Amino acid sequence: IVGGYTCGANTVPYQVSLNSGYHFCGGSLINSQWVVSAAHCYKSGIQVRLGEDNINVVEGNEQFISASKSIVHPSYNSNTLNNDIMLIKLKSAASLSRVASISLPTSCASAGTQCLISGWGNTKSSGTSYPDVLKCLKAPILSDSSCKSAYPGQITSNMFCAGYLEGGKDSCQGDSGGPVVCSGKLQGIVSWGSGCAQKNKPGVYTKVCNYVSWIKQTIASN
Amino acid sequence: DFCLEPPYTGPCTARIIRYFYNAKAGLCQTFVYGGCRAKRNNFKSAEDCLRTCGGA
Ligand SMILES: [Ca+2]
């Protein structure tokens, strides 16, 4: 997260860190046993870390649970990045104030809606600086037209842009799979972009409202 | 020669540690891969990297 602020210990209870010997992606807890993240974060040997604030120090509110299953959307396209969504089943259920699930959306959010994006990714536009604690960013959802103007022929119906055209505030490497929460509902999954916090290049997110059926049914039959 | 190409992080925002052959140093080094659109000078281990590009 470039241009954000320190969220505060366990103020984003649904945020999880996906660890494979180190933090490589974020994710959101949707119930005691399921996590939603990005399809490009698919990796073998994933350990999910809940109740985290400082990812480098054991502070006592953590729960490390290995994934038993990783289901990438059947239509995920690694080239176009369309359908960049994945469900991870926890080997055992998490104990749910510091660890809590986030609600799925009932409908899609509109341009202009203010959302909270969070993660442990790089905090520099030019350079490298990975934080110890969770960073937060409030960014508005942008119109489909401007999104499409920023990324010609790359935006599908399953993606939305959020951020600032001026640049300076954005998601960055290490934030993928994390939540974009608007009005208490999970509306997006951090996905991709052109560089980080560049002018006229806002971040692109997976539009969660289009997968609610798939998510609910997939969770129930696995 | 893809072994002489600079490492490519790509547009995705994961932070996955991969290896690339650094012909200037004559060794395989680590770099942050974003998770998608990998070029060929991108390996999962130093051994794979050396086997494919070593000596390029
Ligand atoms: Ca910790």
- List A28, A101, A176, A191, catalytic entry: A176
User: What are φ and ψ of residue A94, in 5° steps?
Assistant: -75, 155
- How far B43 CA sits from the closest chain A CA (Å)? 14
Residue closest to A134 by CA, chosen among A21, A220, A28? A28
Q: Which chain A positions have a beta carbon within 8 Å of B11's beta carbon? A: 81, 192-194
Domain ranges for chain B, please list them. Answer: 1-56
> Can you say how many angstroms the Cα of residue A16 is from the centroid of all Cα atoms in its chain?
9
User: b/e string for A176-199 if b means 16 or more Cβ within 10 A?
Assistant: bbbbbbbeebbbbbbbbbeebbbe
Amino acid at A133: V
- The partner residue sitting opposite B12, judged by closest CB among A23, A130, A176, is A176
Q: How many whole angstroms from its chain centre is CA B3?
A: 8
- Report residue A118 as tokens: 């969070």
Partnered with residue A31 across adjacent β-strands are: A34
Residue A80: other Cβ atoms inside 10 A: 14
- A6 exposure class (CB count in 10 Å sphere: 0-12, 13-18, 19+): middle
CB A105 within 8 A of CB A185: yes
Technique behind this structure? X-ray
At A150, give phi and psi (nearest 5°): -70, -35
Residues of A in contact with B37 (CB under 8 A): 78-79
For B1-56, the three-class secondary structure string (H helix, E strand, C coil) is CHHHCCCCCCCECCCEEEEEEECCCCEEEEEEECCCCCCCCCECCHHHHHHHHCCC
Query: Is A173–B34 a contact, with Cβ atoms under 8 angstroms apart?
Result: yes
Indicate the fold that domain B1-56 takes in CATH: Factor Xa Inhibitor (4.10.410)
Q: Of the candidates A193, A206, A93, which has an alpha carbon nearest to the alpha carbon of residue A150?
A: A193
| A84 classed as catalytic | yes
CB atoms within 10 A of CB A99: 20
Sign of CA dihedral A204, A209, A210, A213: positive
Among candidate residues A132, A135, A184, A171, the one with its CA nearest the CA of residue A8: A135
Task: Evaluate whether A81 touches A191 at the Cβ level (below 8 Å).
Answer: yes
Q: Are A192 and B32 in contact (CB < 8 Å)?
A: no
A176 catalytic per annotation: yes
Q: For residues B35 and B11, is the Cβ–Cβ distance under 8 A?
A: no
**Domains parsed from chain A with CATH numbers:** 1-12+102-209 (2.40.10.10), 13-101+210-221 (2.40.10.10)
Experimental resolution (Å): 1.9
For the residues of chain A, what is the DSSP string, one character each? -BS-EE--TTSSTTEEEEESSSEEEEEEEEETTEEEE-GGG--SS-EEEES-SSTTS--S--EEEEEEEEEE-TT--TTT-TT--EEEEESS------S---BPPSSPPPTT-EEEEEESS---SSS----SS-EEEEEEBPPHHHHHHHSTTT--TTEEEES-TT-S-B--TT-TT-EEEETTEEEEEEEE-SSSS-TT--EEEEEGGGTHHHHHHHHHT-
CA distances from residue A108 to A104, A145, B26 in whole angstroms, order as listed: 10, 16, 51
Catalytic entry in A17, A28, A84, A175 = A84
* Inter-chain touch B15–A40, beta carbons under 8 Å: no
Q: Which tokens hold the place of B6?
A: 């600079």
Question: Ligand 1 center to residue A10 CA distance, Å?
Answer: 10
Q: Which residue has the tokens 């059947």?
A: A74
The closest of A208, A206, A191, A162 to A4, measured between CA atoms, is A162
Residue A40 is among the residues annotated as catalytic for this protein:
yes
Count of A-B CB contacts under 8 Å: 64
Q: How far apart are CA A113 and CA A92, in angstroms?
A: 35
Enumerate residues 6+ apart whose C-beta is below 8 A from A94.
A29, A32, A33, A50, A63, A65
Nearest CA in chain A to B9: A173
